[PDB]
């Protein structure tokens, strides 16, 4: 499925894994995908989140509260949670439906919003960003 990602979308999921590693987490969850969308910094997703006041620090602090730092450094490559896999599958479906041949950062964020139930979704709400508007603020930047 990675063959369909833009270079920057690829960067998002690489950074998501890096963030999971830094937190001593054993899975790449939707929350790590969220962190990766922010870390990527340049894409429509990063800009949408920045413009809705959703910060790397805000997300990190919520993840620390909800999940917490793990004790032991995990392996090099960390598997996705089932919910994160579902978000990536939905990201493809967003892009297809919108007539886009590639999956960009925008589509990963749209996919996350569409799944709408994982840790990332919970964090976004705790930080006062209703998921509906994230969709709005996104497709608008588009």
């Amino acid at each position: 499925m990675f063959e369909r990602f833009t270079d920057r979308a690829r960067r998002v999921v690489v950074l998501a894994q890096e963030e999971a590693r830094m937190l001593n987490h054993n899975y790449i969850g939707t929350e790590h995908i969220l962190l990766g969308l922010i870390h990527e910094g340049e894409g429509v997703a990063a800009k949408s989140l920045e413009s809705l006041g959703i910060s790397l620090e805000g997300v990190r602090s919520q993840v620390e509260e909800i999940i917490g730092q793990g004790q032991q450094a995990p392996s090099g490559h960390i598997p996705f949670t089932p919910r994160a896999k579902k978000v990536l599958e939905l990201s493809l479906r967003e892009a297809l439906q919108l007539g886009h041949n590639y999956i960009g950062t925008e589509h990963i964020l749209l996919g996350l919003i569409r799944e709408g139930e994982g840790v990332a979704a919970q964090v976004l709400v705790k930080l006062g960003a209703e998921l509906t508007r994230v969709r709005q603020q996104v497709i608008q930047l588009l």
Partner: peptide
């Protein structure tokens, strides 16, 4: 990859 056993090239893990 999108599963569990060993390292994908970039991100995640895969099964045989």
């Amino acid at each position: 990859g999108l599963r569990r056993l060993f390292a994908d090239q970039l991100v995640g893990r895969r099964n045989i």
